[PDB]
Amino acid sequence: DSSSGWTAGAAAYYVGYLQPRTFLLKYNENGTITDAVDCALDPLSETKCT
Amino acid sequence: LTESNKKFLPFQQFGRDIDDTTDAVRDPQTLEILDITPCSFGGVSVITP
Ligand SMILES: *[C@@H]1O[C@H](CO)[C@@H](O)[C@H](O)[C@H]1NC(C)=O
Numbered sequence: 001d002s003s004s005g006w007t008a009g010a011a012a013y014y015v016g017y018l019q020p021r022t023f024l025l026k027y028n029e030n031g032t033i034t035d036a037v038d039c040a041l042d043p044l045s046e047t048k049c050t
Numbered sequence: 051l052t053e054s055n056k057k058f059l060p061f062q063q064f065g066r067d068i069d070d071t072t073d074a075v076r077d078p079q080t081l082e083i084l085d086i087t088p089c090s091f092g093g094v095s096v097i098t099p
Contacts, residue, residue, distance in 0.1 A: 030057070030059075031058075031059065031062065032059070
């Protein structure tokens with residue numbers, strides 16, 4: 001009936017949640033964002049952003 | 051205002067530089083780049099014997 005038989009088919013979707021962090025961003029000659037670093041993961045990144 | 055050679059992305063428009071002022075704009079009608087840089091500064095000098 002309207003509630004039992006149906007075909008789903010293969011798909012899979014990923015869901016995440018965000019968090020207020022600080023980022024360091026690398027823009028290029030086109031101004032397009034080309035790279036980033038999360039300087040709250042490791043000391044070496046902290047050095048980078050400072 | 052001066053005509054530009056800059057190439058914005060289709061949604062981009064500010065003139066934010068190292069100091070983040072304005073040296074770029076897009077005509078809301080012709081959608082072309084107009085660099086902004088004022089006509090002034092300041093320095094003074096009188097020479098006398
Ligand atoms: C954008 O990048 C390309 C790389 O193929 C380069 O040829 C072009 O000069 C760049 N545009 C700007 C805005 O300088």
